[PDB]
Every structure is written in C-alpha cells, then in structure tokens.
Symmetry: C4
Subunit: 388 residues, 4 copies
C-alpha cells in the first residue's frame, strides 16, 4: 500500500536454479490450452504470474492454422498462475492488443496494450484494471513496446516504445508514467542506433534495459534510466561475446558505441544482468537459428571491450528450440538484495517445424543462487508427431 | 457501501478505443463454451463483467441444433470475467429466464429475469443474490425488458418493461425499485409510439434511454427519466441520420415527435450518447441487414431535425455481421467525468449462415477517448466452415 | 457468527416462482459433468448451493455403464454453485459415502456421510470441514439417512436415521447434534409405522419432517421435533389427497394414524409445507410411475381427514420424468417470514430409458410468492437419442 | 499466526474411517486429469490438500506413453482440493522437481523439490511461495527425500535426505530448517543401516519417522527426532510382523538393531504409528507384489521382539493394487489429542498392467476412530480395458 522503491543491490549470481516451467505444448496436445507467443513473467506484492499474447484459439483447435502471423484482432495480453499452462478456463485477460508490457508499482498494476493497423495503431494504458491513458502512433509504422515487464520506483514507471522502420532509423521515446498518467516523455539519446524489445531490471534507484538493435548490431544496446531525474543514456555492451542472433563469430575486441556489423535486419529479444564483476549474459548457442540457450559470466562486459567468459551454465541444448528471453525480479521477496531471474520462450511449430500449421510455445524460468549448483537442460518436451 | 449518485457529466468523445473482445465462437470450435445471444456489459464497484442469456448447450454439443428460437426453459442470465468466453466452468448464473436487465447500486446488484409462456409470464427481481419481488404479466403477450443494464441514483433504479403486441400499440411501464422493492410505477408518457429494448446511461442525476420502436419508426425513441422526482418523458431523436435497421435512406429533414415511416414491424436494439455538441449515434452500415457497425458524431441530434454527421469511426465492416448494441459506463472509475462505453453483438449461424443449425455470438466493446485515435475494424473472426 | 434461531413463521404461499435449474444432462452431452442422483439444495449465511451424491464418472465416460446401482465405493457428497451443473472442475467434495444430509448452523456446516457394506456400514459427522463423530450400524442392514438438508435451532441440529428392513419394521432414531457431538438420541415414537428419507423445514422453534413409509402407507408420515426440549412425535397426514408413488386412487376420507393400504414395499421421497390454511402438498401426477409433478394447496391436510385441493400449480408435465423432491428455506434472507422452497430430481436413463446404460439427473427448484404468478412446466430437456 | 507446537498425544485408535478418495483414474478416462505418482496429503491451518508429483501429461494424452520412468524435466509438485482429482485446471504448482516433501509451520508452508541429472542434482527450498535456500548434491548419485509431509515444532521443521547408492551404504543427513534457512544438519546415527523415503508424524514434542531400508531389511527402520535439541536416533522395529515388500514369511522372533534378511535391493514406502499399546502397523497383503493393504495392531512393536497382532482392518483386498503409503495428521483440528491418519497410493498401468503404455494412480486416506467401526475395502475402481 505504499509505492515500491528500488533500495537493494543484486545478490551474487554464482549459478542458476529452476523457478517455473509450464510444459504447455505437451499438455496442449489433449487439453484446452491457448496458442501464444511473446511470453514473460511479472510479480505482484503477493504472487508472481506467467504472461503472454494469446492468439485466440487452442492448439488443437482448427483456427490454430495461421497463428505464425504476428498482428491480428484476435490476440490479447493474458496472465495465469505460476507454472500452470495458459488454459481457456484459468487465464485472466489484461487488455486487448498485439504488443505489450506490464508492472506493479507496489500499489496496483499498469498494463499497456497496443492494437491497430500498421499505419494507425494506438496504445491504451490500463491502471488498476481500468483504462486511463491512450497514445496514438507518431511515425505511423507499427507502434511497438518491450514485450516484457517494466519497472517502477516510487510511483514512476518508465516504458520504451519504438515507432517506425525496423530496418533503418526509427523513432524511439521513453515515457515516464505515474498512476497511468504521462509525466514526461523524451526521444532516444546517447549512442544506440536502433531500439526494439527492451528487457529491464532495477536496483539502487536506477533501471537498466538491454534491447535489440534490429538494424545492424550483433552486440546489444543498453539504455540506463534514472527514474527520479527522469533521464537516460544508451551505449552498446562493449564485450566481444556477441549475444544477438543471427550473429558472426565472436571477435577478439568488441564495440562500445557502434554496432558490430555482420548481420543486418533481423534479431531476437534478449537480456543481461550488468553488475561489475557479477555480470552474466544470456544468448542462443546456435549463431544462425534461435536454438539452444546459455548463460555466460563475462566480468565487466559493458565497459571492457576485450572481456571473455569466466563460468557458464547451459539452459537449453542446441538441438532444441528456444526464442525470446527477458528479465524480472521479485521486488517483494524478504532478504538483503534482489535475486536476478529470467525466462526463455521455447517456440514449437512454424517456421522450423513446418509439418504442423501452427506456432506456439512453452516457458522455462530460472533465478540465481549464491551456491554453485549443478545444471540440467530444460527442453519444451512435446513430440510434434503426436499432432499429426 | 453507500449508494452511488450520478454526480459527473460525460467526458468529451473525440474517438473510441477497444475495451473488451472475447473471440467466443472461435474458441468455441474446440472448448466448452455456451451458446448465447442478447449480450451486454455491467460494472460493479470493483470489477466490470460480460453478460448474456444462455441457451443451455455448448456450440459443439448436439442440443445446439435449434437455438435460433428465442424463448425456452433452458435459457438463463449468466455473467463471466471481462474478455473471457462464456464457458461451462467459468460462468455464474444470476437468475433463470429469457429476457433480462441488471445493475449495481453501489451497495449490491439487482438482476431481473423473466420466464413463462407467452401468455402467462412473470418477472422475479433478485437483490443481493436472493429473490425479493415478483410481477405477473399485465397484458398477457410476452412480458419483456431492456436486455441491457439498468442505472441507479441514490438507491432508486428505474427499469422499462413492455407487455403486449410487438406490431401495434403495446403497454409499457417504468418501474422504480429500491433495494429490490417497488416504490412506484407509471405507464409510458410523451410522444413515443412503441418501446422495446431500451439502452440506458446516466449523468448529472438524469437517466437517458434510447429504445427501439418495433411498430413503425426508423428513427429511435428516447425516454428521459428523473430518478429523484420519479417521472419521465419520451420523444424521438430529431436527426435525419436514421439508426434503426432495416431503414429507408436518410432524408434531408427528420422527425422529433412522430415515427419516420418506410419499414414496419421489425428492428434492432441500439443506443446513442446524447450530449449537445458531444453527441454520437451508433448504427448498422447495411440499411437492410444487421451487418457492419459505425459510430457517427451528429451534433445536437435530439433537437436539430436537419443535423448531418461531422466525424465517424467504423467498428465492424459491412461484410461482417453485427447485431444488438447497448450502453454502459463504469460509474466507479477515478476521474472528473464518466467515460462513455458500448458493446455490439456479433451474431454467427442462422438465419444468415444457415449452413450450420445453431445461432450464437461474440462481443466487442469500446470506450471513448479525448484523443483522436486511429481505427481498426473488429469482426467475430470464426470461419463457419470449420464447424461442418 | 452466532447460532441461527428459528424466529419467523412461513410467509403465505399464493403460488411458486423458479429459483434454480441447472440443465445438467443437456450440457453433459458435451462437457465434463459428473453422473449423480439423490440431489438437494442447502444454504449458508452468504450463499445457497446445489448438492448430490456423485457416482465417480462423467455421463459420456465409459464407467457410466452401471450407475443405476445405489451403493458403491466411488460415490461422494459434492456441492457446486447455484444453477451450474455438477462439473469435474467446479465441484467441492464434502465427505465420502452413499447416503447423506447437511445443514449450516449459523456458525459453520455439518455434513454426514455413510459408507460400508450393507451389514457393516458407518456414519462419520464432519463439522467445519473436519471429522468429529462416527456411529456404527445398530441393526446391520443398510444404515441410511434423509438425503436432504437437516435444520438447526441455537446449535442443536436433529437428524433422522433408519437402520434395518425396508420391507417390514425397522429401527429409526432421531440424533440431536451440537457442533458435531451427540447430545442425545431417541428411538421413533408416535403412530408412524416405517420411516425412510425425511424432508424437513423449521419455523417458530419447531421442526417438521414429511418422510416416506416404504412398508405400507400411500399417505405420508410426519415427525414433529422440538429442538429445545429434544423430543418428537409422529402421525400420518390425515388428508385423502395421497402423495406417495406408486399409490391407489385418492379416497373420500383419509387416515391420521394408520397407513393407507393399496401399494406395499415401494415409494419415493417427497415433502409438504404444513401450515394450517397455508398448506401445500407436492406429488407425482402419475399414480404408477415417477412422472410429472404437481403442487396442490389442501387446507389443514394434517388434521382434516376429508380435505380436498383448493388451488394447484403444475411443475413438470406427466410426459416427463421426475423423481425425488425435498424442502429447504434460506433462513438468512432479509424479511419478516421464511419463504418456503423445494427441488424435484428429474431422472434420465435406466430403468425407464433403458436405451442408454447410465442413470443421471438434473434439478429444478422453486420458492413461493404472495402473488398469483402464472405457471410454466420445467422438464429436464435432453434428448436421449443424442447419447446413442 | 504463531508457530505450531506439538502439544498433544495421539488419541486411541480402535479402528479406521474413510477420510478422502479421489477416484482419479476412473474420471481420467474422460476428463483432463494429470498422470501422477508418489502421492501424499498435508494440512494447512484452514484446509487439508492432496499432493503428488505430476508427469506433465494427461492420462488420455499421447505423451502418457512412457510415464513409468521416474525422473524427467516434465514432473512437478502439485496440490489440489481434498477428494478431487489432479485436473489440469484445478491444480496448483508448488515447485519443479522429481522428489519432494512439504509441511506448514503454523505461519506458512515449506515445500522442497529436487531436480537434476543423477550425478548433479540440487534441492531448492521454497518458504511462503518463494525460493529461499538451495543445496547441491553431496555424494553425486540421485539426491532424494521423503515423498511425504515433513513436521514442525515451534519453527524448526526437520527433513531427511539420502544421497548415494540405493543398493549399498549411502549418505543420509537430517536438515533442521527454520523459515526456509538451515539451522543445522547431522549425518545419520544409531543402528539403521540404509534410509529411503521416511514417513513422519509428531506428538508431545518429538517426531517419529518410519523409513525404508532399500539395501537389506524387511523389517523397517525408525528415526526418532527431538526438534528442540535438534538430535535423533535410529533402530529397527523389533516386531516379527514384517512390513516391507517384497519380504519373507513373518518369523517367531524379530530384530531390533539389525536388518531382517531374506530380500535384498528393493522395497516400498510405508509407515507405522508407534504408541505403546496403541500401536498400529500398515503393510501390503501380498508378500511379493504391492497388492492389497492392511492395518494390524501389534502392541509395543518397536520394543517387543516377539509381538503378534491383536486386531486388524483391511483397507484394499489382495486382488487390487496398492503402492506407497504415508502418515499425516491435522495438527489444527479442535480436540484433546491428534487423530492419526494415512494414505495408500493405488497404482494402475505398467509394470503389472502392461496392456497400456502409462503408469498413474488414485488415492485413498483414512483417519482413526475411538469406536470400533465396520470395514469396507477401497479399490481404485477403473477398468483398464476402457483405455484400449
Ligand atoms: C555438474 O554441474 C557443474 C555446474 O554446471 C558443471 O560445471 C560447469 O561446466 C560447464 C561446461 O564445461 C562450465 O561452462 C563452461 O565454462 C567455460 C569457462 O571456463 C573456463 O575457465 C576455467 C576457470 O577459469 C578454466 O579451467 C577452463 O579451462 C575454461 O576455459 C566457458 O568457456 C564455456 O563456454 C564456452 O563453451 C560453450 C560450449 O562448450 C560455448 O557454447 C560458449 O559459447 C563458450 O564458447 C564460445 O564462446 C567463447 C567466447 O567468445 C569462445 O572463446 C569459444 O571458442 C566459443 O566460441 C564459439 O561458440 C560460440 C557459441 O556457439 C559462437 O558464437 C562463437 O562464434 C564460436 O563459434 C562454458 O560456459 C561451467 O563454467 C562449469 N561450472 C562450474 C561452477 O564449474 C559440471 O560440468 C557438471 N557435471 C558433473 C558430472 O559434475
Ligand atoms: C487513421 O484513423 C483515422 C481515425 O479513424 C481515420 O480518419 C477518419 O476517417 C473516417 C473515414 O473517412 C472518417 O469518417 C467519415 O467521416 C465523415 C465526416 O467527415 C466530413 O467532414 C469533414 C470535416 O468536417 C470533411 O472534410 C469531409 O469532407 C466529410 O464530408 C462521415 O461523413 C463518414 O460517414 C459517412 O460515410 C460512411 C462510409 O464512407 C457511411 O457508411 C456513413 O453512414 C456516412 O455516410 C452516409 O450517411 C450520411 C448521413 O445521412 C449521408 O449523407 C451519406 O451520403 C451516406 O449515406 C448513405 O449511407 C448510409 C449508410 O450506408 C445509408 O443509411 C444512407 O441511406 C445512404 O445510403 C465517415 O464517418 C472520420 O471522421 C475520420 N476521423 C478523423 C478524426 O479524422 C483515417 O482515415 C485512418 N487512416 C489513415 C491511413 O490515417
Ligand atoms: C395462467 O396461470 C394460472 C396460474 O397457474 C393458471 O391458473 C391455474 O390453473 C390450474 C389448472 O386448472 C389450477 O389448478 C387446478 O386447481 C384445481 C382447484 O380448483 C378448484 O376450485 C376452484 C375455486 O375454488 C373451482 O372454480 C374449480 O372448479 C376447481 O374445482 C385442482 O383441482 C386441480 O388439481 C386436480 O387436477 C389435476 C389435473 O387437471 C390433477 O392432476 C390433480 O391431481 C387434481 O385432481 C386429482 O386429484 C383430486 C383430489 O383427490 C381429485 O378430486 C381429482 O378427481 C383428480 O384425481 C385423479 O388424479 C390424481 C392425479 O393424477 C390421482 O392420483 C387420483 O386418483 C385421480 O385419478 C389443479 O390443481 C390453479 O388452481 C389455477 N390457479 C389460479 C391462481 O387460478 C391459468 O390456467 C394459466 N393460463 C392462462 C392462459 O391464464
Ligand atoms: C464387520 O466389521 C468388523 C470390523 O472390521 C469385522 O471384524 C474384524 O474382522 C477382521 C477379520 O477377521 C479382524 O482382523 C483380523 O484380526 C486378527 C486378530 O484377532 C485375533 O485375536 C482375537 C482376539 O484377540 C481372537 O479371537 C482371534 O482368534 C484372532 O486370532 C488378525 O490375526 C488378522 O490378521 C491376520 O490375518 C490376515 C488375513 O486373514 C492376514 O492377511 C494378516 O497378515 C494376519 O495374518 C498373517 O500374519 C500373522 C502375523 O505374522 C500370522 O500369524 C498369520 O499366520 C498370517 O501370516 C501369513 O500372512 C501374512 C500376510 O499375507 C504373511 O506376510 C505371512 O508370512 C504369512 O504368510 C486380521 O487382522 C479384526 O480384528 C476384527 N475387528 C474387530 C474390532 O473385531 C467383521 O468381521 C465385519 N463383518 C461382519 C459381518 O460383522
Ligand atoms: C518509497 O519512497 C517514498 C518517498 O521516499 C515513500 O513515501 C514510500 O513510502 C517508500 N516506499 C515504501 C514501500 O516504503
Ligand atoms: C491451413 O490453411 C491452408 C491455406 O491457408 C490450407 O491449404 C491448409 O490445408 C490448412 N491446413 C490444415 C491442416 O487445415
Ligand atoms: C449519495 O447521496 C446520498 C443522499 O445525498 C448520500 O447519503 C450518499 O452517501 C451519497 N453516495 C455516496 C457514495 O456518497
Ligand atoms: C436438426 O434438427 C432437424 C429437425 O429439427 C434435423 O433434420 C437436422 O438434420 C438436425 N441437424 C443436425 C446437424 O443434426
Ligand atoms: C439465538 O439464541 C441464542 C439463545 O437465546 C442467542 O445466544 C443467539 O445469539 C441467538 N442467535 C442469533 C443469531 O441472534
Ligand atoms: C455395459 O455392460 C454390459 C455388461 O455389464 C455390457 O454387455 C454392455 O454392452 C455395456 N454397455 C456398453 C454401452 O458398453
Ligand atoms: C509455540 O511455542 C512458542 C515458544 O513457547 C510460543 O511463542 C508460540 O506462541 C507457541 N505456539 C502457539 C500457536 O501458541
Ligand atoms: C509407445 O512408445 C513405443 C516406443 O517407445 C511404441 O512402440 C509404442 O507403440 C507406443 N505406444 C503407443 C500406444 O503409442
Ligand atoms: Ca541485430
Ligand atoms: Ca423500427
Ligand atoms: Ca409407501
Ligand atoms: Ca527392504
């Protein structure tokens, strides 16, 4: 009942442990499970929940033929209990739309959904289950946002939005909201060239997002936000350990304020926890496909342009599919520091498994441990052949 | 915990944004979704909910053959969470009956359901989940009511009921209830000739319903109710922009106190927000069929008999089906004024899609914005051919 | 939070209105609805709920073949929300057993379930969701109880139990419980010859049950209980309007303290509200089969042995099946008097509809009105042929 | 809201009554019921719940082929309402893992789940729905725990864990936790040679577990724990009434501090309530297979090495399958003493019913009575042939 404030620093990440896995596509072969994609996790003062953009069909239903398409009037942001599947009967609709972000401010939740045609789309900001604010497209070419949770400090919750070309310069703005109302907005500043899908976290009153340059870098851009002064900056992660996908081989030296060239016009949503020596970067194992997933500790990745890994942990092996990943923490857990967590989308169906007509996913999430725990790999686990 | 009072005026409607869509018939192709019709939306102090008259079968179940019929013992008023489908497992039964209305008074909810044979039907008024009052038919030919929400001011909630011919003079009464008990009732007064299905809203202690003349007008009747004095009046909307269906072409001049002739004995439930310059009228695009849906701003429509549109927004295109529409507002939202909202029923199956044996629907709702947002069209989205 | 006390008298019953109908077997043709029988209704301080003995299968599931049998280890007492069907996902298990009764005492609920072989059965009394007391069989031949709700006054809730022959003399006892513990029990007294399945209600600190003589009467026995003194008496209803089934024609004169002969060894659970001039008796229309259902007002039925009906209302027509019926009232409704209510079981499947292999039912309930409302008939409504 | 303390002694067990039965596999033939095994029951201050390790498929779904295997990434600890089946829509996920234990401390619940490869597995301890502590494998060969509930006294909840060979010496430790944090741990002491799966209960501030020696005894080991001093001891049950399975014939004399030889390398989870004269031992009726189940009163079984039964009760007959059984009590029931309770797993499918490709189960539980109640047998009740 009073606003949350980013008081603590991150605990030290010596390894990762399972947090949630829902086995959605497995159980969807014989249950009324919704078709989704763009998943993420967000916590309330009293519970943590799984989130996704629905496609408005079940996996086994006939209107699943066609759900590879990204934007439509039948998608919505839904949430369901931790480690359960997105079922028709157990899901809660947050807002209607095909791009989204959501966070709790300590008092209540803000969710944002965008719908529209490509050239005349709008966002409407819901606070405490009601509509309060709406924003129309400014550059008229697919107004989009984070597709993962936002973060708040004493009432002000910043959200990044891009509008325009995915393949050239675009127009990006950071909006600062408080109780659903706009307090201020700014256009992108600093050296990042293109922004798409930021994954954010906060600690000691500052917010760090790791985004996706779709235009030209294979290294990732970082926006650092100060929620009290309401300002930001961008840079790229210095380290030569490249984490977009597709990507060239990792070099010996990296780039701090310019894109690393090699692949143009394509990518994936990813994240990193940037904390001096305690820094871990997540990435696909395949340099060409969204397959496999690994976590790599690369001390000072943001600043040291010659930093190489020191420790690692395999989350999904290279023979199984992965997808989008993002960052969340439970800011209301008891303790001296915030425990870092993440999720990875495990996509099944088209384009790669084109033997079915649908595209859906399950989720795995992980949080950190100060211990050095042994690892296991966490694949989706369905057999596509049962759906034929 | 104290009665709600209509204190505020309506905000200004410069455009409309999506509020809820449930994609019911799509998900019903492979889920246990109930067959409905006559949908509507109503809010409580803490949540808003979707409502409909059930037919007592699922879409894919065999007893769906025949659900084009309107009155039977297997129908009931049910409600379910906002933007979810009317599922067997997630629905709450309010009362049993084939005509209905419901509203919350700030303390608890009143729901009214009517059942009976055509010539010996009765209403029973439920307040706080219990039966309190019952009313028997007065003219002995299908006692019916609004099929959308009612509105209350400091305890008194007025409901319009018609009993008698749908094709001639009928007998209409406005009942004023407080905590489920009748305080007073009056017969219809003013110049409206026939009343059927009123859609109502309230602002600054007055209640405005826009009803359907089934006998002879293609322009709509308006009943204005004063809940403190408990009195009313009726008129027709002056404007030549005609909003019943079927209807003749729009004329150059309209009628304020007489039906506009052209079609007899047929129509549809509709609504309008009548607020001086801030007035918007909803209607089907097809003049002959319940297809398409548009919102048109017609300044002073109620009084100016030569008023033409000034701005518009397309809700459903003319190639897709629509149906009944109604008005609601969330009287418990924070803010200086009430935000105007509406829903449109999207009917699928018989009579027009006679290639199946059932009749069902989904819902779309919209609320207003002070912004000028771009539009999208919101069709049901099922493919009838998957049900064959 | 303090015990309920039977303070009020019954309102006057000038007619009956629908209360709940669940359309269970209809929706069970394509949903996961449980197979039941022996239904009833009971209210809490804040909600009223439907109740039944489950058979541990769904209608469409394969283990429904065989559910005509009455006693087994797979049955349980379950409850679900008013006017919803007994679904696998929406039902709450009260206790395990094949005979039962339940009531709320103003503080919490007592439910009683009996399980066992025919010759070594036991009751275990649950109070506030926990086991507190157990009772073993005293005559060793199917220990059974009411199969409808019990009634409490200031803590003491009396329950009737029979143990022994259904076709001769048996041993019946009235147990008086308070918070789940036995306070006292007595054997049957007065002139009733055989007791089976009592339906009870209470008003002005006295409790009236109308039971079933299975041995030899076609008129029904009445046990009157004083919950403060903890004593009772039995008699038969004097009136010649006979309400068991099967039964001979109604005579001109009836019997107050002896069975009316004509049918031996068979019957049905029924009820009556006995209140001087305000007395209404329920019965099947068929004298030979459990088909049809009617309510008949027979002034002073209990005492006047030559009393004939004065007013009636048809609940289910003679061409549709009915079954067991019982009495309940919502003792926590606002008002000056208790509104009388009842339910009728609508059995479908074997023995009469032997073209399927299962036996199940739906429910209809009704409460009274001081008005004279018109009637409708309320049949189950499924078509057996869809299950073939 | 203050920690629970084991204050009472056990009531006297003169017989057992049904508590819960869910009929899971029966209803699973036509419902969305999850495949499980290793079931158990645990109570909260306000409700008791059924628990199991899920396999991440439904019975009728295709990925049920293969669920005989014990460890995988698709299993999780789930709970659902008492006497309902583990349904996709009604289950709550506690933690992810293939071995587990859980108990409520009077303030909130601790659940522990283990996942990993055989040689690099870890436990993570959840307290109040969040991760707090993690423990890595110490002997690197399937780190496992109780698979039934743990017990707490004034904050400290002891858990037994084994890591290492199931067929030789292993390494067992008792961890003492308070609010999810480790207070202390000790290695096994006393005369028990091998520990696996302990079933525990507590009364008058001491905790008694009855475990399974997988290496060589057919008599069972007992660990007695003092939660204030945080220490323990082990012994074997003296009595010649042998309760592991498989097992040799019961001898005339038993062993108190050595394994009884006869079968090596195999067994089953079981339990006993050890209370002087009031002592009852549970066991399979088959000496060779997990079939049938009986309860036997063997006065002073723990100490008297020549003790024979004095009274018995058959729970499941020898022609039907049983499986794992464990102990729980509802420490928050009103009363002067704790009522002893237990559950038995009823396994269906492979290995014995190899005509299907899946392995699943239902549950029966029982609590004690001071009465001498008659018995019934409680089999699963599905017919495997309906699944073909
Ligand atoms: C029990 O559980 C424990 C805990 O999990 C297990 O122990 C863990 O084991 C992991 C696997 O070995 C290990 O992870 C590796 O750590 C390496 C860092 O360690 C180095 O330092 C130590 C000490 O400082 C030295 O002793 C040691 O010699 C090491 O050099 C990482 O280097 C590993 O990551 C790299 O390998 C994997 C696959 O093997 C690649 O996918 C990954 O991308 C890394 O390699 C690429 O990238 C680097 C950086 O640019 C390149 O230099 C390199 O050549 C590779 O480049 C190619 O590949 C990428 C991606 O495909 C491509 O983009 C690029 O262009 C090139 O093509 C790895 O992270 C854990 O650290 C260890 N944990 C602990 C606490 O010990 C234990 O094994 C389990 N089992 C048992 C039975 O106990
Ligand atoms: C991005 O999003 C924005 C926001 O949505 C989009 O901008 C909107 O675009 C809408 C479509 O053009 C527009 O809506 C129209 O507005 C007209 C009013 O504008 C007039 O005034 C302006 C300024 O004052 C003038 O500049 C302009 O010249 C206009 O004259 C309405 O007139 C329109 O409604 C009529 O047309 C539609 C179909 O086109 C009909 O269905 C509708 O019923 C109206 O026409 C019938 O009725 C009238 C009244 O009787 C008759 O006079 C007329 O002849 C028609 O009559 C026949 O049809 C009816 C029904 O079928 C039948 O019953 C009758 O008998 C006859 O047969 C329409 O409402 C928005 O106002 C505009 N919004 C804003 C804020 O700008 C933008 O386009 C999007 N796209 C991009 C890429 O940016
Ligand atoms: C609109 O709605 C309103 C409200 O519902 C409708 O009005 C109601 O209409 C009902 C049907 O007529 C009516 O119910 C009947 O009431 C009779 C009592 O009325 C008598 O008194 C009035 C005034 O005092 C007199 O004017 C009138 O002449 C009457 O004599 C009951 O007698 C009726 O019950 C009997 O008939 C039914 C079927 O018709 C039997 O099933 C039932 O069992 C009763 O008859 C049997 O039992 C008696 C008693 O032993 C025997 O004497 C008799 O011969 C029958 O015996 C045989 O049958 C039984 C059972 O099968 C068997 O066991 C036995 O052995 C024999 O074989 C009936 O209850 C309502 O009272 C009336 N309500 C009001 C408020 O007016 C209106 O019609 C609707 N429609 C429209 C368009 O408005
Ligand atoms: C109504 O309900 C009531 C209540 O349930 C019913 O009454 C109950 O009836 C039960 C069945 O008879 C009865 O249970 C038995 O109790 C025996 C103890 O009673 C003895 O003492 C009394 C009084 O002190 C004496 O009068 C009497 O003579 C008895 O000797 C137990 O001994 C019974 O258990 C043994 O038998 C069963 C099967 O019959 C075995 O499965 C079980 O394992 C026990 O026998 C094996 O084990 C012992 C110990 O080592 C061996 O000595 C023995 O030879 C057996 O060994 C073989 O089998 C085991 C397992 O297969 C194997 O491992 C081993 O190697 C050997 O191969 C049994 O528990 C209740 O006590 C009684 N309750 C009450 C309150 O009275 C009533 O019948 C119901 N019906 C009606 C119509 O009323
Ligand atoms: C956060 O900080 C503000 C301003 O310092 C304070 O009012 C608020 O109570 C703090 N939040 C909490 C949960 O203490
Ligand atoms: C999916 O749709 C395409 C055309 O859009 C059609 O050819 C194809 O056969 C459909 N797939 C299935 C399995 O229905
Ligand atoms: C509405 O008005 C009445 C009478 O003026 C007043 O008692 C009531 O409290 C008001 N409602 C609210 C919510 O303030
Ligand atoms: C629906 O009912 C009609 C007769 O009422 C029957 O002829 C028709 O075939 C039925 N339709 C289906 C699909 O069962
Ligand atoms: C019922 O009567 C008892 C004894 O007179 C009294 O204590 C109790 O409070 C009464 N119940 C209620 C709800 O008032
Ligand atoms: C039901 O069981 C009987 C034998 O008990 C069997 O002959 C019959 O065919 C079964 N009915 C169905 C539909 O399976
Ligand atoms: C348990 O004992 C502790 C220490 O004596 C005490 O503080 C606690 O309140 C007791 N628990 C309860 C429920 O009384
Ligand atoms: C199960 O899997 C095996 C191979 O793992 C396969 O041969 C078998 O036919 C499968 N069973 C079924 C019913 O699919
Ligand atoms: Ca890129
Ligand atoms: Ca009309
Ligand atoms: Ca009889
Ligand atoms: Ca052993």
């Amino acid at each position: 009942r009073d606003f949350n404030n980013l008081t603590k620093g991150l605990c030290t990440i010596n390894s990762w442990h399972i947090y949630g896995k829902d086995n959605a596509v497995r159980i969807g072969e014989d249950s009324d499970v919704l078709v989704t994609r763009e998943p993420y996790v967000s916590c309330d003062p009293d519970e943590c929940r799984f989130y996704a953009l629905s496609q408005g069909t079940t996996i086994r239903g006939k209107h699943s033929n066609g759900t590879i398409h990204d934007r439509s009037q039948y998608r919505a942001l839904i949430s369901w209990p931790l480690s359960s599947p997105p079922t028709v009967y157990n899901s809660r609709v947050e807002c209607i739309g095909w791009s989204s972000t959501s966070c709790h401010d300590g008092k209540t939740r803000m969710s944002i959904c965008i719908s529209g045609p490509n050239n005349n789309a709008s966002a409407v900001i819901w606070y405490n289950r009601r509509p309060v604010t709406e924003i129309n497209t400014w550059a008229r070419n697919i107004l989009r946002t984070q597709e993962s949770e936002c973060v708040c400090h004493n009432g002000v919750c910043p959200v990044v939005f891009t509008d325009g070309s995915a393949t050239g310069p675009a127009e990006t703005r950071i909006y600062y909201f408080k109780e659903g109302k706009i307090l201020k907005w700014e256009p992108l500043a600093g050296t990042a060239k293109h922004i798409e899908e930021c994954s954010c976290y906060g600690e000691r009153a500052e917010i760090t997002c790791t985004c996706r340059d779709n235009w030209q870098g294979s290294n990732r851009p970082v926006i650092r936000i100060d929620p009290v002064a309401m300002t930001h900056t961008s840079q790229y992660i210095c380290s030569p350990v490249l984490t977009d996908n597709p990507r060239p081989n990792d070099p010996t030296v990296g780039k701090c304020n310019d894109p690393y060239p090699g692949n143009n016009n394509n990518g994936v949503k990813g994240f990193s926890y940037l904390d001096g020596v305690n820094t871990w970067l997540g990435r696909t194992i395949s340099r060409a496909s969204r397959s496999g997933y690994e976590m790599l500790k690369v001390p000072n990745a943001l600043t040291d342009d010659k930093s190489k890994p020191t420790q690692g942990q395999t989350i999904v092996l290279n023979t199984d599919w992965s997808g989008y990943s993002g960052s969340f923490m439970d800011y209301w857990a008891e303790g001296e520091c915030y425990r870092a967590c993440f999720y990875v989308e495990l996509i099944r169906g088209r384009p790669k498994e084109d033997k079915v007509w649908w595209t859906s996913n399950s989720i795995v999430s992980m949080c950190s441990s100060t211990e050095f725990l042994g690892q296991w790999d966490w694949p989706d686990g369905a057999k596509i052949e049962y759906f034929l």
